[PDB]
Amino acid sequence: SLSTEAIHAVQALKRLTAADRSPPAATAAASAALGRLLRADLLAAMAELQRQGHWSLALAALHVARAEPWYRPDPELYATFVSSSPSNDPAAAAAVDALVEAFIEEKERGAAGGSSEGVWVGEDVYKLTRLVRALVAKGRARAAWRVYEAAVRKGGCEVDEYMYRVMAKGMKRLGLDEEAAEVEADLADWEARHLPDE
Amino acid sequence: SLSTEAIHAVQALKRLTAADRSPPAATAAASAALGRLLRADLLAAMAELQRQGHWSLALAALHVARAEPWYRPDPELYATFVSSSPSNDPAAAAAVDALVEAFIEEKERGAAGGSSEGVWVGEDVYKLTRLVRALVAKGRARAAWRVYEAAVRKGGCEVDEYMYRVMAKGMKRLGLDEEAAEVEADLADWEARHLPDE
RNA sequence: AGAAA
RNA sequence: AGAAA
Known part of the structure; x- marks a missing residue:
């Protein structure tokens, strides 16, 4: 309360x-x-x-x-803002995209090192998945992609199957078929290293 | 739940x-x-x-x-694993094939008898069809074929038209035209014994 | 826990 | 029931 x-x-x-x-x-x-x-x-x-x-x-x-x-830049905090944002609201949608850009800039604001690069490496997988889920739920396909690409693709944040499935299905049904395929590839690579081989 | x-x-x-x-x-x-x-x-x-x-x-x-x-080796159980497997995932696909090989080995593990041979004879047709359907749906043409050949062709499990049609269409569209023809032949034989003759 | 195509 | 080329 x-x-x-x-x-x-x-x-x-x-x-x-x-x-x-x-x-x-x-x-x-x-x-x-x-x-x-x-x-x-x-x-x-x-x-x-x-x-x-x-x-x-x-x-x-x-x-x-x-x-x-x-x-401190927090994915959960940002997710609540996405979740509570008004549906069918062009202005709101832009505000959401802007918010996502603000979150990635705030997070990466402190990075200038060949020192162990980990602005995204130590990020909370669940919270980050929640942010992505919310963005997808509101049709912010691009925004969702910026986050994934930033934290996982480049940021080197190790996620799990749940995260991948969320993205793949999200991009697909939202009409970014290009990016959907890349997520599936990322997932394929992941599977290729965790799946018991022989 | x-x-x-x-x-x-x-x-x-x-x-x-x-x-x-x-x-x-x-x-x-x-x-x-x-x-x-x-x-x-x-x-x-x-x-x-x-x-x-x-x-x-x-x-x-x-x-x-x-x-x-x-x-106990169960086709339905295995089908869920095929259905839930990630699409466009080389590693996953191999895991699926391996799974099919595991199911047939588990099932046939208990057979060393001229005693009424029925490792496959008493198998649930619907469940077995579901496994085959899933494998086809994921492009595991070979895997699907191993199962059919094992349980129906040799195992002597009596199936129905629905099962045959699923296989024939599956092999065809998946590019095993050789095996497709054999299924149609199996179906032809089946029809030759159930179709009211004259 | 990251609640249901 | 083995849900839609």
Whole structure:
């Protein structure tokens, strides 16, 4: 559930942006109501806004969160934003794609080393699969592909059959037959190394 | 559905093999999570893994199952493994062929008698047809042929028109025109004995 | 756990 | 029941 501090923060955010729906003031209202909540409270506020349907406000909260010092690029966090995004909404869809681009840029922002390259290597497989699943579920075939290609194809994040099947089926039914075939190939390679051989 | 015992077993299996994807440890994890489940639970676990896409794990479960005392070579069981196998996967395809060879060896393992030869004679026609259908559907023309030839041609398992048509059409479209013709001949013989003559 | 073409 | 060239 939500601490009274987070509940009051959400109410505060809504009531302020009510008198002015405009996004410029909406931002200033977010840092005003959510500016300095403990990580746990800010995350709960965000989730509550998503749950209620105030997606644009949830995004505003994300903005605030990105400024916090504890902030870290997290696939699960991004998946909730995709899941809660409005269906049949061109603007929303673009926002989702943009979000995916933001997640990969945030994650890879800290990489300049021949040092053991692992920006994606240590990533949570389940969470990353959840993000991909959500993107597919919302028809963001391209976005899904950027993520897979970034974290698995290049990032060298070791995934499993479940992840592959999700992608292959996703790309297929979404009309990227080209990429579907590549996933199947990646899967084929995987199988070629885990399947008991003789 | 799945007993909580089987659900927990599957979770357990995944979580263990997660820290180590390698097949040697994957096997030890299977006998560790699935080692002593009731037949019903082990079978349900296997099917759930297939459903999720963890085919290599489903195969690991099969290994465990083969050691159980209640285990019996079953065409249906093998068909599910063929159906759930990844398409466009050289390794998988070989695994399927190997599986078919394992099924025929397991079945015929108990035959050393001029006693009424019936290792295949009492076989379930529908299930056996399902296995053949799946193999064809995955392009395993050879594998399909081994089964047919073993159980019907030699094993003396009495099948029906549905089975023949499935094979003939399967071999044809799969490019074994030689074997297709033989099936049609087998069918011709069948017809010659069931068709009302005059 | 990454809930159902 | 062995679901659609």
